[PDB]
C-alpha cells in the first residue's frame, strides 16, 4: 500500500473523470435514452455507480490473426517516442507506424544545446532536473531502459546570492530587503519574511481535510476549484474564515515566486501539488550527464521506424464512409497520407488547434479544451566564460540558483561542471511568464554577426555583476566572457508555443476528462503532458502515452497485447482507472460515439 | 456641466489618489511626524480632508530671469513628442531638451507599415481607430493641430461573417453555432445567445449604484476591486447575491470576446469602462487617411529639437551631492549624458524596468509598480491581394470585422480602400493575448527569401477560405494573393513589449497613484498610457504628458508658464486634480521627499 500523500493526485484525477462521465452519461441517457456500449435499463448515474466493463471477461489473464494495421504518431517529443518504444516492445504482428516530426530536430521540449561537442559545453533549454519521488517511477524506468548517466542535481547550493530592492539577503535579519511597512515599504510586516509558511498554511488547511476524509475533503476542495491561488489568498474564501492578505502582501509573494506560474492556477491543484513532495521535500534531484537530449538520442535510435523530420501535419481526418480499420489520414505539405487505423497526436495543444481537424468531427467541448488552455512562457539565456568565476571567486561551488528582482530573475549554477577550471557554461538567466516574454523580446532567431554584442548580452552581464557584486566587479565578468552565448524562448517556438500548459481556475477539473478520452470512433488520441494529471513534467508525457496505447489496444480488442502492456509497462500508480469497475471503457465509449 | 457618465472615470481616478495620499500622509506623520512641504499640527488625514496648496497664492491668475535649463525626454512615441510640442509652444526662455529614441523608427505604438508609397498600400500595426467621445477631446485637438485627414472608421460592416464550431452565424436562429447544452454542447442555454447582455447586466448593477450615490457606489465597487471580471461572474460576489455562471458559460463569453483581455482585469475598472461609451455606444469612429504614422511625421517635424534615434537609455541617475538644477544624467551606450534638470520617461514600463535606476533611489513600491504590471500581447497580419475579393465577391463593402474561433481569430476589412478595384490590403489577422502569442510564434523578424511562403501565410490563407467559404474557394483566394505580406507581434518588440498595460485585480487602485507621482526630488516622471486612467488609448498617453509637464513647471515654480499651460493645453476633463484643495501638490511633495 502507498501512503495517502502519494495517492491523492491519482485519486483526485480518477474522481474528476467519474464526476464528468456520470454527468455525460445521465445527459446522454436524457438525450438519446440509449448509449452504444451499455445496456440502459429504464438522475440515474453518479460518480460511485457507473456501469462495469462488458468486455472484461476477455481481459482477465485466465501468428497473423491480427490484420495488417498502421498507426500515425504526430510529434517526436518524448511522448511520441515513448509510444513507439512501447509498440516496438509489444511486437504486434503486422502492426507498423509512421512518426512525423515538424521540426528538423527530434525531442521537442527535451532540448540540449551544445556550443561544442566538448564534455560539459552545453545547457538544457527544456527539461533538466528530475526528483526521486514515487510519481516519477515511470521516468526513472525509462532512464534505466535507455542507460542514462544520472548525476546529482543541486537544487539548493552554497553561497548563492539573493538580490531584492538592491539589498542582498542575510540570515537572521529582519526584512533584509527593506521592503516591509516598518521600513517605509508596503509589504505587511507579518508576511515579508514568512512567505513560504503562509503559503504552506493555506494549502495545509485543505491537505488536512483530505487526509482524514477524502470525499469530504474533495467536496470542500471543489468549492475552491473555481478560484486562483491569488484569489484565495485575497479572500481567505470561500466563506471565508481563512486568513486574508492585502494587495502588497500577495504581490510580494509573487515577486518571491521565481519558477513557473502558481498564483494564477487553480487553488485546488495548488493544494494537490503540495502533496507531490511530502515524503517530504528533501528527495534527491537528478540530471542527465551530457544533457537531456541524450535520452532523445537513445530513444529515437532504437526505433523500428525512423522519425521523419520536417513533416508538419496540417490536417487530420477520418473517412466514416469507409468501414475498414485504416480509414484515417493526415495532410502534410498538401500531400495526403492515408491508411491509418489510429492517430496519436502528441503535440502541444496550440499546435493541434492550428490544424484542420474538421475531418475528425470533434465535439465542441473537446475542441474547447484544445483551444482554450494557456501555456506558461519560459526563457533561458546561457553564457560561456573562460573560467567558472562563480565557483572560484564567489564560492558558489555546489550548484544552486540565485534569485533577484533584476530582469534576469534567476541565475542557475550548473551541477555538471563543478570540477572544471577552464571554459564553463553558466545558465545566466532562467525566466517564466511575463519575465520570460520580456527577455524573449530580446532573443532573436537570427543572432548578431560576430563578434558584436547585442542588448541581451549587455543586459545579462550588467545584471550578473550587480547580483554577484559581493565578490565580482562588472569589469571582471566582462573580461571573463568569451563572446559565446545562446538563448531560447519557448513561446516563440511555433512547434511548441510555451513551456507547458497552465490550468487556470476550473480548467483542469472541467477539461482534463475531455483531453484524456479518445475521439473519432476511438481512433484519435490527444497525447502529451497536458493530457495528464502529472502535467508539466516528463512523467505526464510518459503516462499519457501509456494511457493512449491502452485505449488503442482496447479499441481493436487486442487482449493478448493489452495484458502484455499491463505486465511490462505499468509503473508507479496508474492514472487511468481500468478494471471491471473502472472508467476507462466509459471514456472509450463516450469517445467512440457515432454521429 | 458634464453628465455623470462622462465624469465617473475622472472622479474615480481622483478619489483613488486621495485614498492613497491620505494613507501615506498618515503613515509619514506616524513615521517622521513632520513632512517637508506641510506644516503638521499635533489617523489624522483622510480622503476628503487633505492640506491645501501652500503655493497657490502664486498660481492665481491675478526675459532671462529663468536660469538655462535642459530636460531629457526618454522615448519618441506620442507621449514624448507631445511633451516636446507643449514645451515648444510654451517657449520657456533658456529651456531646451534632448529627446532620445531607442528604435531607428519614431512613433512607438503609432506605427503604419507601408508596403509601397502607394495611396492605400498600408496597414496600421499600432493604434488605428478613434471614437468621438468627450474623453477624446485632447486627441482630436492634436489631430486638428497637426492637420490630420480624418475619415470614417467602420466598426460594424455589412455581411461580415462569423464562424464558430464550423457554423456560420445567422440572425433569428437559436444557437446557430450549435454549442449549447440543448444541442449536445456544454454552454448553458440561457447564455449562448445572450453574452452581451449578461455582461451589461453585471456592470449595470454597479453603474446604477454609482449613478445615484457616488461615494456609496465607490465603496461598493471597492469590494469587487480585488477580483477579476471572470471571478465576479463565477461568484456573483462578493456576498454574493448576483447571478452565477458556470465554467463553460464564462469560457464561451471569453471565446466570443475578441479584442483586448477583459476577463482577467479588475471587475471594478470593467465597470468604469462601461461608462466610456454611454453617450451611448453609437459614436462615430475615425481613422487617419494615409495611416496613423502621419501624426508621428507631423509631430516630429515641427519639433524645435530633432529626435535622436538609435539612442537607447540604459540608466537614469541624479546627483544629490550637487545642489544645482541640472544634476541628472542618463547613460546611452556606455556614454553619460548629463546636465538635466528633469527627466521624462515615456517608455513602456517593461523597458523602464530594464534600466539601471539605482541612481534615482526609487522607493520600492514605485519600483514594484514599474516591474509588476503585465502587458497584453497583440499581433497583426496583413496580406496584399490583386483585387479586393471581400468587397467584390463577398459583399463586404463597408469595412467591419469578421470573428472566428479559427487561429486568425479576427479579420478586419480596411475602411480606407472601399473604392479600390485593383491591389488591396487586408488585415487578415488581428489577435490579442495568447492568440497573439501563438500567431506571433510564426512571425519571424527575418522574413523568408522570396518567393517562398512560410507557415504563417499558408495558415492565414486557409483560415480566410473557411471564414469566407459562403462566397469564396481556397483556390480563388490563393490565386488572388500577390505574395506580399507583413506581420508584427508587439510582445516581440523589445522597445515596447506588448500592446498596452493590463491592470489585474487591485493593480490600478494600488499602483496608479505611484505611477502618476514624481520622483527624485520631483525631477523624475513616469509618463505614458499606463500612467493614466485613460490607459490603452492615445488620450492616456497625451494626458500623462500634460500631467508631467504640469508637475515639471510646478517643481521649478514657473508660474507664468504654468498658467499658460492651463490656458492653452487644457482639454476635456483634467485627470490631475489641481487647485488650492487639489492633490497635485501632495503627489509632488510625496514624490520629492529627501533620503
Ligand atoms: C523550459 C522547460 C523546463 C522543464 N522542466 C522540466 C523538468 O525539470 N523536469 C521534467 O520532468 N519536465 C520538465 N518540463 C516538461 C517536459 O519537458 C515536457 O513535459 C515534455 O518534454 C513534453 O513532451 P511531449 O512529447 O508531451 O510534448 P513535446 O515535447 O512538445 O512534443 C511534441 C512534438 O510535436 C511536434 N509538433 C508540433 N506541431 C506539429 C505538427 N503540426 N506536426 C508534427 N509535429 C508537430 C513538436 O515539434 C514536438 O517535437 C520542462 C519543460 C520546459 C519547456
Ligand atoms: C496594436 C495596438 C492597437 C491600439 N489601438 C488603439 C486605438 O485604436 N486607438 C488608440 O487611441 N490607441 C490605441 N492603442 C494604444 C496607443 O497606441 C498607445 O497608448 C500609445 O501609442 C502609446 O504611446 P506612448 O508614447 O505612451 O508609448 P510608446 O508609443 O511605447 O512610446 C515609448 C517609446 O519609447 C521607446 N523606448 C523604449 N525603451 C527605450 C529606451 N531604453 N531608451 C529610449 N527609448 C526607449 C520606444 O521605442 C517607444 O518609441 C493601441 C496600441 C497597440 C499596440
Numbering used by the authors:
A (entry chain A), B (entry chain A): 3 to 44, 51 to 70, 79 to 611
What does the paper behind this entry write?
l-Lysine oxidase (LysOX) is a member of the LAAO family protein and has strict substrate specificity for l-lysine. LysOX from Trichoderma viride is synthesized as a precursor (prLysOX) and the N-terminal 77 residues are cleaved to produce the mature protein composed of 540 amino acid residues. The mature enzyme consists of three domains; the FAD-binding domain, the helical domain, and the substrate-binding domain. The active site is present at the bottom of the funnel formed between the substrate-binding domain and the helical domain.
The propeptide (M1–R77) of LysOX folds into a sub-domain on the FAD-binding domain with the C-terminal region (Q590–K611), which is disordered in the mature LysOX structure. Unlike the precursor of PAO, the propeptide is far from the entrance of the funnel leading to the active site. The propeptide induces a structural change in the helical domain, but no significant change is found in the other two domains. The movement of α9 changes the shape of the active site.
